[PDB]
């Protein structure tokens, strides 16, 4: 099955900087990657679908990019509410799989 690798597992950044989460698939999956945010004791929340497509209700500072095997989730000017775990998910091949997750500091 498709392995999604999120490295590093922890990103530490100063308030206001631009941060980039990395997601790498074990094989080409076009743009079939989706991003989720999970805060402490919360349910996951969709941030970006199909690598770059924005979702209504999500702050404009969230963006996504990449295609093939390497994907990036970016936050322009990180603020306190962005503190959470970030997961990528592929829907290119069955079964759907999740990345291991990156924590934001």
């Amino acid at each position: 099955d498709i392995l999604l690798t999120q490295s590093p597992a922890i990103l530490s950044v100063s308030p206001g900087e631009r941060v980039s989460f990395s997601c790498r698939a074990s094989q080409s999956i076009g743009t079939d990657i989706h991003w989720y945010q999970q805060r402490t004791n919360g349910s996951p929340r969709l941030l970006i679908k199909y690598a770059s497509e924005s979702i209504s209700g999500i702050p404009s500072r969230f963006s996504g990019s990449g295609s093939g095997t390497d994907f990036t989730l970016s936050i322009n000017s990180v603020e306190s509410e962005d503190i959470a775990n970030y997961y990528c998910q592929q829907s290119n091949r069955w079964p759907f799989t999740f990345g291991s997750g990156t924590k934001l500091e």
Partner: protein, 102 residues
Amino acid sequence: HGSALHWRAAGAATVLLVIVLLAGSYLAVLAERGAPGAQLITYPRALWWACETATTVXYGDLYPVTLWGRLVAVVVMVAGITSFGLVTAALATWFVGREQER
């Protein structure tokens, strides 16, 4: 309703083809999910796949790997080929009648 049979059947084949494309899309996804490595597993691209399958184009970007996905594929091919063949037959009948009058 006494309009030409060849145009009625052609219309019927078109409507039926659209139904096959939609049903084919639905049934392919239903069949292909559960099979490791299968790519024909979301509806929008499944409909695109059905189109190239019915026209016999295929490109190879998407295709079924399961028995039931392939059976669905064969139905889509036959329905597509028959439909276009029925249009051609209708066109011939039109031309033949018009050449008699000419």
